[PDB]
């Protein structure tokens, strides 16, 4: 076997996979195996990209026997995996050991589950014909518009409050002041009218927040950054922020936004896409209501 | 790796210089992309003329490494329902480009196979989201497209490839594969091409496989006719002469001998017969009508199925009756 | 990043719009007075219907265009409940407008919208006629139900004539400072056949691919419209000339047989200088050929036989 | 036990009376049941092809072939809508009927034949009215009986072989079942009236029944039952030849068409056609018997008969290639009145 | 225990006969990997399915069918969504890693074959999805198209797939194969019986094989060591005897309508299919030299029209009666 991994605590794996089910449940996940660990990436409509990474120390029997360039790809349907795993991993403290296997290329993804003298073995055939490779919605750190670190619980509560309101179009605000009264909020408009959820300047949920001038070194005060993001991406990310410790916000002048989720724990990084243009001249009325 | 693919896919053009025949369209689109102006190109023409190959080469030329995350390719293999179309194209066009300062190109292969409401949504998105997003329409049939779509999109017509383009592609294939064809074989391939490149590549691969050794030999017209199954022009001329001269017995005997010696099909035989008959002159204006109607009925019956001998005798009788006027 | 000539020169006022001079003038008086009734605009696509509606709304509102319009298009969640709720919420708000001005709601491409949504629209207009107004944009008025057409004023749009399209072409040429020729402009008009957007696209293709606008360049980049060739070959007297015309045009330029049959059917339906019996016989033959092609027999021989039968019934031996 | 067809049904190869060559052919096929190819039976209706199939199955398997069982199951064709097929079951073989609609019939045959085939001492199935197919289930048949030719043997019985496509006729053996002559039908009638101890004044009544039925055993037996029950089991030479009301209506319509040729006559003929089609009667056989009734009139000359038969063939082609049924019959009748005078 | 149609199915590419171009191309592709998409068309019972099965057997081996070869047919549902998802999936499945036994026992190519049997029963949208899928997955996935009628298959499919015409198996085309089958099965026939069988089934070896099997079964059941004659196979196939055809011709020649009508009624009572009758009448009329050119042309047109009417699924009685009446009035 080229890749092998074993784990005893499947609660972490299943709660990490539950954060991918709102949109990634359909198909077309590109798992990566390397010396760093195990990673899953999902990208639909080329509008949002999610990366969930599993470290070496998470697995107990990581071997990774290879004699190549050390980068092998495989694409498997998520829905088959979810349907297979739904029946197992039942009850609590079932000490279900999961064994991962992949014989390089042309072999199905093999999962072995053992639960109280009862073993299971599911083979997941992959799809590697039209794999265009490369891909990735990456951004350069030399021109980051602003950086923000927020608590996971506050963001989860904000998103779960925003979801049921509606708000098919959402906005992201960034603002810094000289008196350390930093302003950060995710406002939106809906049929209800105007919805404003505000994250205060308290360091409990706004530990770090600075607005840059496109050089990632020159921090400035009194400058406003407007981010027009669709409701779909925020709805998809709401589940991913349900269980977390710290959430990192970072977008550049290009408008693409990278959100890092910390939960040692695993790291989840998601890349977003901004809308082409703001609706007419709305951004003006966003600030005009913000200092109102 | 290469050298293990069909010649249709192996010889797929990758640059605009590799597309032959449609010099005017290539020059026009090169002038369009040199100015950074893409006015919602629409490509129309018979299959095998190089529409999707041309758009792929253009996307490679103007983007390079941006094809993986800027070009949205949609086709018949993907579901194109009204909700699916509106959601997917709205999400793709409404989002700003990541880093490239250029228009976003969306390729819609086989656009004729969509519903009217989906076409209306697409034509609304074309005019609405157009600041950064452009559209490409590929369809062999224009009757299934909304006339509003043909107005907002610049229509480019793909003519059948002339003899020069086919000859140049044949020469390139021969250079690549180290193969030789007789000039008579080249003329036969030109006649059989009917303005198609995929058919030419397929029959060239089949004829190369037919040869016992690829090298130290020359491809003639006989091997091309044997592998492709197309009747020889001499056989068609002999059949027509027997029909026009031998009344009913030896003409039928000659037709049966021709159909049995090499196993020719009736469809190709009648197609050849009418092809030579089109060159002939008929100063009656009524024999041609009877010929065309009877031959079309014969093709319809053969498509519906029947007896080959009875259909061939019907062809002979129809030709003789039409020429008796 | 240069916008195409179609979208770079979109009119912003009703004065720049050409075509139906009387309708444009009436829209100008409606904008000036402010009395905006419910309207339905139908006609040939790409003649300036949605553009005219947008210009009228802009001239009527001014600075109130930020909130005073709810442009629901075909490419949207056009259902029965969410659309009704959105229109109700739009109609249950008031803004600071003059008493002679009213809110305008634009529904482009109302033909494809579901009939239940049409009934919901009727309910919204009946309930909130005093505050908001509705402006429809469509190609034909047949798809709009009768009760909705009853509560509005219908303004049919005619095809743009030679003068208006030529004038717009001259203004755009002067704006772009592009050398042109009268013969080239005539060829552009002939290929457009009354279409404005198609004429602009053809002019843009001519100037990009060749520069100077000439008839030869226009004919090279784009061929003549197929209905004209179909009409030319259908009324041909001798069978040989019609056969040669159809071959050398359609098969050499690469036109699909089913498209040829559909265009011939449309031409025969719109034909004028033909008897009723001849027209119906030709329609029957067109239907037979269409069935043969749809089943799978769509070769040149079928088209030749169809022309032969048409000429036989024309001459009657 | 109350009909001639069920009480006196032969159940063996030796029990068959007519078509001795066909009996020898079936015996030769049943000599080696393992090497039995796919069978296709074509011939006139009422000849007894079903009887030959049952006799062959009984010879191949043995007792219990003629014992039948009834089971019902539903096939889903669209959403929650399902249509049920009244399939008849039996040990060692099986029988189905194409009573479903012309479009769902293909998927019903697909599912049923996939379920029956399975894996396996083969199972034989009889395809009644194989000609009544829309060229869609025939592809399923030609695929399954070629790929799964290890445990299934399709038996095809039909009256017309022309609607059956060429590949199906290629893969299936052509079995010919000619209708019996007058002498054989007369002998069968004599035997069945001897077994029923009914009176028989003369032997000409059986010959008249045979001529009236036109080589149809079922029609002959039903007519014999009708004359036996109507005359209190006492056949007479003066007893009228009883015919079904459908043929009587067809003949009356023919006489009306010959006598009266107008527009009111045309609309009454249309009403009669509508009423006849209301009885679940196919239009093709209606047109066929109308043509045969029109062709026997002595008043008409050769030209009128030729015109009528040409129009009948043309409108039969139209009905075969068409969807509706009233239009082609109406056109045929209108053309008949047009060409009569 | 097995019918001769299935028992004698060619499992190898060298067993099939009368096909030179396709067999040579497949044999030369066995040692290479440049296999294009194949469009198999021709008369029914020619051997396209046998050829593709033999090619698949000699390409990969028995073990790779379960995980590498998937076929489409009319036996299962073939809706647009089902066909789209199934074809896209199987054209996206990876090339399975071969075992060693396949590697030094068979020349396994790095692609896979998708078989589309009876493709003429597919909708236009399904065909468009198939052609787009096979263009976008032409790397390690191959498509085989088999159809009896070329016209029903759309033009782009015929352009993209290599056209491999299957010639009809005439008497001289399959005489050797029939002789080998008869010798292997110990079948005794007279000089001109296999040729007559092949002439009966024009371009159809399956019908000839079935007729030979029926004749052998009849000869075995009869018991005597006799050779099968042309009359027996002709009457088993359904060939009208020459005397009855001569009587039909004589009745047609006579200008009596009632005699023709009653003869047609008796012929339908005999239950013989009118397609073979039309074919035999055509052969007799064109073969005979006692008729002029104009009458031959008219009768050939009439027989062609009658065959076209019969192919649509009409009543054989009415068509044959109309044809005989039209011939008698020429
Ligand atoms: N101008 C050309 N010169 C040389 N080869 C060509 C040219 N155009 C097409 N071909 C060949 O044709 C093959 C298939 O053409 P495609 O462009 O993929 O299909 P198409 O012409 O767009 O037709 P469809 O039915 O619309 S997909 C390519 O892989 C080339 O090998
Ligand atoms: N009268 C006109 N004068 C100048 N430009 C015009 C005129 N009419 C149309 N155009 C141009 O054509 C473009 C398209 O006009 P639209 O109003 O979008 O067409 P339409 O009448 O709404 O029909 P559709 O959109 O196909 S349903 C405009 O943006 C203008 O650039
Ligand atoms: N070249 C051949 N040599 C020997 N037997 C052949 C040959 N071609 C066909 N057969 C026989 O024909 C029978 C069936 O062959 P098939 O391959 O199913 O015919 P087919 O081409 O599939 O016809 P279809 O499926 O109706 S289009 C078998 O008994 C084969 O042995
Ligand atoms: N050889 C035979 N001897 C006596 N009666 C026969 C024979 N063959 C058929 N029949 C009669 O035919 C009747 C059944 O006909 P049927 O099978 O319904 O005809 P078809 O198969 O054309 O529908 C039976 O009642 C039986 O009496
Ligand atoms: Mg293409
Ligand atoms: Mg518009
Ligand atoms: Mg087959």
UniProtKB/Swiss-Prot annotation, chain A:
It comes from the Eukaryota. Keywords: DNA damage, DNA repair, DNA-binding, Hydrolase, Nuclease, Nucleus, Phosphoprotein. One of its GO terms (molecular function) is double-stranded DNA binding. Signal peptide: none annotated. GO terms for biological process: DNA damage checkpoint signaling; DNA repair; double-strand break repair; reciprocal meiotic recombination. GO terms for cellular component: checkpoint clamp complex; nucleus. It is found in: Nucleus. Component of the checkpoint clamp complex composed of DDC1, MEC3 and RAD17. The interaction with MEC3 is performed in a RAD17-dependent manner. The checkpoint clamp complex loads onto DNA. Interacts with the DNA polymerase zeta subunit REV7. 2 RAD17 subunits also form a heterotrimer with one MEC3 subunit. Belongs to the rad1 family. Present with 189 molecules/cell in log phase SD medium. Component of the checkpoint clamp complex involved in the surveillance mechanism that allows the DNA repair pathways to act to restore the integrity of the DNA prior to DNA synthesis or separation of the replicated chromosomes. Associates with sites of DNA damage and modulates the MEC1 signaling pathway and the activation of RAD53 in response to DNA damage at phase G1. The complex also physically regulates DNA polymerase zeta-dependent mutagenesis by controlling the access of polymerase zeta to damaged DNA. This is DNA damage checkpoint control protein RAD17. The gene is RAD17.
Swiss-Prot record, chain C:
Coiled coil: none annotated. Pfam families: AAA, Rep_fac_C. Gene3D superfamilies: 1.10.8.60, 1.20.272.10, P-loop containing nucleotide triphosphate hydrolases. It is found in: Nucleus. It comes from the Eukaryota. GO terms for molecular function: ATP binding; ATP hydrolysis activity; DNA binding. ATP binds at residues 6, 18, 43-51, 139, 197. Keywords: ATP-binding, Cell cycle, DNA replication, DNA-binding, Nucleotide-binding, Nucleus. One of its GO terms (cellular component) is cytosol. GO terms for biological process: DNA damage checkpoint signaling; DNA repair; DNA-templated DNA replication; leading strand elongation; mitotic sister chromatid cohesion; sister chromatid cohesion. InterPro entries: AAA+_ATPase, ATPase_AAA_core, DNA_pol3_clamp-load_cplx_C, DNA_Rep/Repair_Clamp_Loader, P-loop_NTPase, Rep_factorC_C, RFC_lid. CDD domains: AAA, HLD_clamp_RFC. The keyword Transmembrane does not apply. Component of ATP-dependent clamp loader (RFC and RFC-like) complexes for DNA clamps, such as the POL30/PCNA homotrimer and the checkpoint clamp DDC1:MEC3:RAD17 complex. During a clamp loading circle, the RFC:clamp complex binds to DNA and the recognition of the double-stranded/single-stranded junction stimulates ATP hydrolysis by RFC. The complex presumably provides bipartite ATP sites in which one subunit supplies a catalytic site for hydrolysis of ATP bound to the neighboring subunit. Dissociation of RFC from the clamp leaves the clamp encircling DNA. Belongs to the activator 1 small subunits family. Present with 2760 molecules/cell in log phase SD medium. The gene is RFC4.
Curated annotation (Swiss-Prot), chain D:
Gene3D superfamilies: 1.10.8.60, 1.20.272.10, P-loop containing nucleotide triphosphate hydrolases. Disulfide bonds: none annotated. Keywords: ATP-binding, Cell cycle, DNA replication, DNA-binding, Nucleotide-binding, Nucleus. One of its GO terms (molecular function) is ATP hydrolysis activity. ATP binds at residues 5, 17, 43-51, 218. The keyword Transferase does not apply. GO terms for biological process: DNA damage checkpoint signaling; DNA repair; DNA-templated DNA replication; leading strand elongation; mitotic sister chromatid cohesion; sister chromatid cohesion. Signal peptide: none annotated. Belongs to the activator 1 small subunits family. Component of ATP-dependent clamp loader (RFC and RFC-like) complexes for DNA clamps, such as the POL30/PCNA homotrimer and the checkpoint clamp DDC1:MEC3:RAD17 complex. During a clamp loading circle, the RFC:clamp complex binds to DNA and the recognition of the double-stranded/single-stranded junction stimulates ATP hydrolysis by RFC. The complex presumably provides bipartite ATP sites in which one subunit supplies a catalytic site for hydrolysis of ATP bound to the neighboring subunit. Dissociation of RFC from the clamp leaves the clamp encircling DNA. Present with 5040 molecules/cell in log phase SD medium. This is Replication factor C subunit 5. The gene is RFC5.
UniProtKB/Swiss-Prot annotation, chain E:
GO terms for cellular component: Ctf18 RFC-like complex; DNA replication factor C complex; Elg1 RFC-like complex; nucleus; Rad17 RFC-like complex. One of its GO terms (molecular function) is ATP hydrolysis activity. SUPFAM superfamilies: P-loop containing nucleoside triphosphate hydrolases, post-AAA+ oligomerization domain-like. The keyword DNA-binding applies. It comes from the Eukaryota. It is found in: Nucleus. Belongs to the activator 1 small subunits family. This is Replication factor C subunit 2. It comes from Saccharomyces cerevisiae (strain ATCC 204508 / S288c) (Baker's yeast).
